[PDB]
Design an enzyme around this catalytic site. Structure first.
Site, PDB file in Angstrom:
ATOM      1  N   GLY A  51       0.812  -1.189   0.000  1.00  0.00           N
ATOM      2  CA  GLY A  51       0.000   0.000   0.000  1.00  0.00           C
ATOM      3  C   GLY A  51       0.844   1.236   0.000  1.00  0.00           C
ATOM      4  N   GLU A  52       1.962   1.173   0.683  1.00  0.00           N
ATOM      5  CA  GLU A  52       2.842   2.318   0.864  1.00  0.00           C
ATOM      6  C   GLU A  52       4.289   2.080   0.477  1.00  0.00           C
ATOM      7  OE1 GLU A  52       2.560   3.984   4.791  1.00  0.00           O
ATOM      8  OE2 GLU A  52       0.356   4.060   4.722  1.00  0.00           O
ATOM      9  N   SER A  53       4.706   2.822  -0.537  1.00  0.00           N
ATOM     10  CA  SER A  53       6.057   2.660  -1.061  1.00  0.00           C
ATOM     11  C   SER A  53       7.100   2.933  -0.009  1.00  0.00           C
ATOM     12  CB  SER A  53       6.269   3.526  -2.277  1.00  0.00           C
ATOM     13  OG  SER A  53       6.077   4.922  -2.016  1.00  0.00           O
ATOM     14  N   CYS A  86       0.949  -1.545  -7.250  1.00  0.00           N
ATOM     15  CA  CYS A  86       0.698  -0.391  -6.369  1.00  0.00           C
ATOM     16  C   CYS A  86       2.002   0.167  -5.798  1.00  0.00           C
ATOM     17  CB  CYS A  86      -0.309  -0.764  -5.305  1.00  0.00           C
ATOM     18  SG  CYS A  86      -1.257   0.683  -4.790  1.00  0.00           S
ATOM     19  N   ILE A 148      -7.612   1.433  -6.081  1.00  0.00           N
ATOM     20  CA  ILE A 148      -7.851   2.015  -4.752  1.00  0.00           C
ATOM     21  C   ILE A 148      -6.686   2.914  -4.360  1.00  0.00           C
ATOM     22  CG2 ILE A 148      -8.486   1.540  -2.353  1.00  0.00           C
ATOM     23  CD1 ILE A 148      -9.536  -0.986  -3.128  1.00  0.00           C
ATOM     24  N   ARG A 149      -6.952   4.214  -4.401  1.00  0.00           N
ATOM     25  CA  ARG A 149      -5.937   5.232  -4.187  1.00  0.00           C
ATOM     26  C   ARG A 149      -4.731   4.922  -5.077  1.00  0.00           C
ATOM     27  NH1 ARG A 149      -3.777   3.747   2.101  1.00  0.00           N
ATOM     28  NH2 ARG A 149      -2.581   1.869   1.449  1.00  0.00           N
ATOM     29  N   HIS A 191      -4.969  -3.116  -7.818  1.00  0.00           N
ATOM     30  CA  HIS A 191      -4.853  -4.238  -6.882  1.00  0.00           C
ATOM     31  C   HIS A 191      -5.331  -5.512  -7.528  1.00  0.00           C
ATOM     32  CE1 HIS A 191      -3.803  -2.540  -2.937  1.00  0.00           C
ATOM     33  NE2 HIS A 191      -4.157  -1.407  -3.532  1.00  0.00           N
ATOM     34  N   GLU A 193      -5.052  -8.439  -6.732  1.00  0.00           N
ATOM     35  CA  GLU A 193      -5.475  -9.444  -5.774  1.00  0.00           C
ATOM     36  C   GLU A 193      -6.865  -9.251  -5.250  1.00  0.00           C
ATOM     37  OE1 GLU A 193      -3.961  -6.649  -5.114  1.00  0.00           O
ATOM     38  OE2 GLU A 193      -4.343  -6.207  -2.952  1.00  0.00           O
TER      39      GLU A 193
END
Length: 216
Positions: A51-53, A86, A148-149, A191, A193
């Site tokens: 979700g977050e790099s 993502c 998603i975002r 995403h 998945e």
């Protein structure tokens, strides 16, 4: 033949990505978590999700960037297949914009591999229909993606980058780039998945299989 695909797991929330490859039901395929350089060494291909790099990158920074340097080598010297999705897509990118958190790593933030400029910024969930520019049997008509975002691919920087999938959204506009491929690297902003179908997983598996075959 035995093909091993690894999923970077340090950042957590990796199980659904593993499950989505298991759903392929392909005899020859094994999936492993990758948490360190030993694990990475066993991999014929690697998926970097997240979700977050910034979180995934910090996870690779341990022991003076030991895993970061091994990932760079895996990508750019060994040329082994890699799928960044993502956060992973951000961390393959050449130019990263709007990541806010100043990095203790500077120009060592990205692993590189996709010559694109990507924006984290940073409404913002939807399912889109994909226009997929491929002859692969992984991609049937009217496939979808869950954004998603999602990060935004603002620039393609090389003719070596192939735009693999685009979509139109009544906001963002037409021809938003969803997936790119460059040499051994695949990147998706969505995403894969979080929708039942397994098309991108299948495509990435075939990428890894063709890599292994090329070696021999």
């Amino acid at each position: 033949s035995e093909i091993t695909i690894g999923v970077l797991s340090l950042q957590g929330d990796f199980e659904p990505h593993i499950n989505h490859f298991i759903k392929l039901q392909i005899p020859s395929l094994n999936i492993i978590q990758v948490r360190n350089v030993h694990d990475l060494g066993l991999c014929d291909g690697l998926v970097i999700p997240g979700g977050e790099s910034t979180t995934v990158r910090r996870c690779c920074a341990y022991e003076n960037d030991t895993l970061y340097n091994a990932l760079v080598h895996f990508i750019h010297v060994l040329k082994k297949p890699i799928w960044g999705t993502c956060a992973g897509c951000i961390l393959l990118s050449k130019n990263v914009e709007n990541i806010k958190l100043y990095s203790n790593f500077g120009n060592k933030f990205s692993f590189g591999g996709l010559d694109i400029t990507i924006c984290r910024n940073f409404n913002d969930s939807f399912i889109c229909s994909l226009n997929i520019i491929s002859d692969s049997s992984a991609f049937k008509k009217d496939l979808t993606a869950a954004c998603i975002r999602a990060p935004y691919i603002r620039e393609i920087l090389s003719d070596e980058v192939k735009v693999l999938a685009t979509f139109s959204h009544e906001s963002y506009g037409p021809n938003i780039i969803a997936a790119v491929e460059q040499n051994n690297c695949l990147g998706t902003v969505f995403h894969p998945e979080l929708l039942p179908h397994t098309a991108f997983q299948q495509y990435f598996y075939e990428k890894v299989k063709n890599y292994k075959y090329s070696l021999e």
